[PDB]
Amino acid sequence: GVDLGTENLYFQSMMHILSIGECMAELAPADLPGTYRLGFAGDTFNTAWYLARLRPESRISYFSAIGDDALSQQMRAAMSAAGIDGGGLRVIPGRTVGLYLITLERSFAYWRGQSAARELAGDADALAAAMARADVVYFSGITLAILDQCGRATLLRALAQARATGRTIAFDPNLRPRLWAGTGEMTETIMQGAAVSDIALPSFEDEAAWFGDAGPDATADRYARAGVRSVVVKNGPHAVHFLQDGRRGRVPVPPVVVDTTAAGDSFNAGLLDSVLAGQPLETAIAAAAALAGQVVQGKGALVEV
Amino acid sequence: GVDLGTENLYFQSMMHILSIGECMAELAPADLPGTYRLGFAGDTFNTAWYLARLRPESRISYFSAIGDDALSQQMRAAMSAAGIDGGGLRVIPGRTVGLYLIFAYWRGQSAARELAGDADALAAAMARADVVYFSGITLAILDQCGRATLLRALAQARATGRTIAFDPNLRPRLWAGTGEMTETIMQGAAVSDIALPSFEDEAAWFGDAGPDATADRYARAGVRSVVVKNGPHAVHFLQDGRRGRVPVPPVAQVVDTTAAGDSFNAGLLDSVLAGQPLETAIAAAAALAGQVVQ
Numbered sequence: 314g315v316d317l318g319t320e321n322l323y324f325q326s327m328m329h330i331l332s333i334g335e336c337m338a339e340l341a342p343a344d345l346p347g348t349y350r351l352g353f354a355g356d357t358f359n360t361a362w363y364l365a366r367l368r369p370e371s372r373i374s375y376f377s378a379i380g381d382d383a384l385s386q387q388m389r390a391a392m393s394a395a396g397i398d399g400g401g402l403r404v405i406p407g408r409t410v411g412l413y414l415i416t417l418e419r420s421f422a423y424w425r426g427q428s429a430a431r432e433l434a435g436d437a438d439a440l441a442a443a444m445a446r447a448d449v450v451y452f453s454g455i456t457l458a459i460l461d462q463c464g465r466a467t468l469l470r471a472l473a474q475a476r477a478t479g480r481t482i483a484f485d486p487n488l489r490p491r492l493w494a495g496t497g498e499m500t501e502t503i504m505q506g507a508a509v510s511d512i513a514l515p516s517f518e519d520e521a522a523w524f525g526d527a528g529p530d531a532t533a534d535r536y537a538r539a540g541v542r543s544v545v546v547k548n549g550p551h552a553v554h555f556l557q558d559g560r561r562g563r564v565p566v567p568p569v570v571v572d573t574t575a576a577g578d579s580f581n582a583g584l585l586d587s588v589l590a591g592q593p594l595e596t597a598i599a600a601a602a603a604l605a606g607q608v609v610q611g612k613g614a615l616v617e618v
Numbered sequence: 619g620v621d622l623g624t625e626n627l628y629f630q631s632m633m634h635i636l637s638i639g640e641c642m643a644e645l646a647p648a649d650l651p652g653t654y655r656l657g658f659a660g661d662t663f664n665t666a667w668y669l670a671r672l673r674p675e676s677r678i679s680y681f682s683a684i685g686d687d688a689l690s691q692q693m694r695a696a697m698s699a700a701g702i703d704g705g706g707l708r709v710i711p712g713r714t715v716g717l718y719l720i721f722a723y724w725r726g727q728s729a730a731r732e733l734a735g736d737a738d739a740l741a742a743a744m745a746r747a748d749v750v751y752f753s754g755i756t757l758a759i760l761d762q763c764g765r766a767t768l769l770r771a772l773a774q775a776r777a778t779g780r781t782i783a784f785d786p787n788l789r790p791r792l793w794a795g796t797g798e799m800t801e802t803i804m805q806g807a808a809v810s811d812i813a814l815p816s817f818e819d820e821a822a823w824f825g826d827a828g829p830d831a832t833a834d835r836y837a838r839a840g841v842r843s844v845v846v847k848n849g850p851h852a853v854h855f856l857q858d859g860r861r862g863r864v865p866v867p868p869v870a871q872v873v874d875t876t877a878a879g880d881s882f883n884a885g886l887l888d889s890v891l892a893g894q895p896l897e898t899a900i901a902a903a904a905a906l907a908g909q910v911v912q
């Protein structure tokens with residue numbers, strides 16, 4: 314149902330962004346007590362969701378793996394309804410998607426340890442093909458976390474070769490220790506992700522905790538050392554710090570905070586949307602923060618802004 | 619939060635049944651489309667739930683393992699509301715319970731898989747219980763070591779006079795292989811006084827010629843009372859070499875057979891605990907299941 318536009322050998326009618334990672338079934342409190350609404354979310358998927366709203370004229374694709382059950386079909390449908398191109402989704406027979414439940418104090422429970430999405434880097438050829446004509450390929454530290462050793466290698470090799478042909482690679486380290494076997498493995502693998510990326514979107518609070526960065530500018534230096542060309546350091550309610558080809562700066566973030574979920578994912582979409590438009594980095598960061606600011610004044614992961 | 623009665627050295631004021639296995643979170647459709655109601659279920663827990671309803675005068679305990687998150691605490695509270703003694707539940711920090719959505723399942727990493735991790739805790743749960751009930755699902759979710767631990771505790775309990783009841787409850791998807799499944803089920807039979815197989819599932823996997831052959835297979839494993847369920851057909855039984863059949867009264871307006879076996883099992887065990895003859899207990903069990911399927 315989603316319009317993929319047209320193409321010739323040289324150009325496509327639509328700008329193309331690919332997001333790679335895991336989308337999950339989400340059950341969140343409904344109005345009637347004891348009941349829950351079924352939706353879909355997951356960090357990289359949320360970013361794609363916001364992108365589709367920001368640029369409905371563009372092609373926003375999602376690459377992942379789902380099962381073959383009712384719930385998987387439901388997820389596939391929800392993607393199309395959101396204007397997201399799920400044509401590349403791998404189907405893994407006998408399996409289902411990951412799920413999480415929000416209970417309400419607000420708490421989360423996850424069942425994603427055996428999700429189909431963990432097989433998303435099982436087919437190297439399908440990955441390359443998904444990336445081949447993408448203007449931007451976006452992935453996260455959660456994308457890396459859920460894969461085994463071979464899957465990580467396959468994904469990183471694909472991103473690196475895509476990068477070399479001229480795809481712009483964007484990465485949100487999105488540190489979630491509970492998804493990794495150990496902190497050593499997490500930090501190492503995250504920086505492997507950095508080494509294939511042009512744009513990195515770390516969050517200072519998390520980076521400081523695990524890498525021992527003394528401040529946001531030290532966070533930026535760390536990613537620049539891995540070859541990242543544009544580092545954008547998200548910083549809670551504080552100014553966003555950046556570092557691009559040796560040049561530094563800070564972009565003020567106006568004071569606005571119901572729900573800091575989706576903040577980072579919406580920020581990323583706002584940033585990538587503006588970068589694709591050919592806007593200078595500082596302009597893109599301002600747009601990213603403006604979107605995130607309006608989102609954190611909203612209810613949920615997916616806030617119709 | 620559930621009264622457990624009183625005791626002296628010789629007798630307890632309440633008869634005591636312990637069920638061992640996995641309780642899961644269940645999400646089922648509510649009226650509002652796209653919304654689901656959260657409840658708790660799972661084979662051995664369902665049997666315990668029905669048993670508690672049938673005998674408010676008794677102590678119905680559940681032994682399992684849960685997590686330490688909000689959902690696990692909700693499960694604990696639901697058990698207590700249902701009159702079930704969850705005082706022996708083990709808590710596995712960082713883990714959560716299994717879940718299913720209406721059937722799609724997430725149970726491969728549930729805390730309940732650790733329920734046989736502490737041998738002393740299992741033995742204490744079984745002490746002074748009159749009946750200990752478990753299923754083939756209880757066995758399926760454990761690793762090899764947990765299986766050995768549980769079976770050894772069950773056999774030791776049986777050696778001390780606890781009555782052991784088993785429902786094979788064959789579920790192929792939960793096992794690594796067909797062979798492992800059949801061998802382990804029969805190991806469960808080997809520690810059980812009472813077995814409650816279902817002919818439809820047994821026949822597909824053991825090659826039983828008919829319900830009497832199913833009964834014979836369990837009897838060779840040392841089961842004293844075998845009660846073979848068979849959908850709407852007569853229940854066959856075998857007890858100490860004596861065969862019999864008990865009719866299942868026809869039910870026309872059938873609605874949901876999911877809890878049929880678990881409610882049958884509770885009905886049977888309730889009547890056995892009351893000292894009713896096996897044929898009487900089977901009829902009581904059929905009657906309850908009949909109401910439940912409607």
Ligand SMILES: Nc1ncnc2c1ncn2[C@@H]1O[C@H](COP(=O)(O)O)[C@@H](O)[C@H]1O
Pocket residue numbers: 516517518547548549550553566567568569570573576577580601602603605606609
């Ligand atoms: N308390 C807040 N006040 C204003 N903006 C925020 C706040 N929290 C998050 N944001 C925005 O969301 C982005 C993501 O921040 P982070 O949560 O550190 O990933 C920030 O860079 C801001 O643009």
Ligand SMILES: Nc1ncnc2c1ncn2[C@@H]1O[C@H](COP(=O)(O)O)[C@@H](O)[C@H]1O
Pocket residue numbers: 816817847848849850853866867868869872875878879882903904905907908911
């Ligand atoms: N179609 C049916 N009509 C009447 N009773 C049933 C039916 N299905 C199941 N039951 C009852 O539930 C018990 C267990 O069913 P099953 O475990 O599916 O063989 C039977 O022994 C009957 O007492």
Ligand SMILES: [Cl-]
Pocket residue numbers: 488489490491492
């Ligand atoms: Cl985490």
Ligand SMILES: [Cl-]
Pocket residue numbers: 625626627
């Ligand atoms: Cl006393």
Ligand SMILES: [Cl-]
Pocket residue numbers: 788789790791792
């Ligand atoms: Cl099964």
Ligand SMILES: [Cl-]
Pocket residue numbers: 894895896897
């Ligand atoms: Cl008898």
Ligand SMILES: [Mg+2]
Pocket residue numbers: 671672673674
């Ligand atoms: Mg009664």
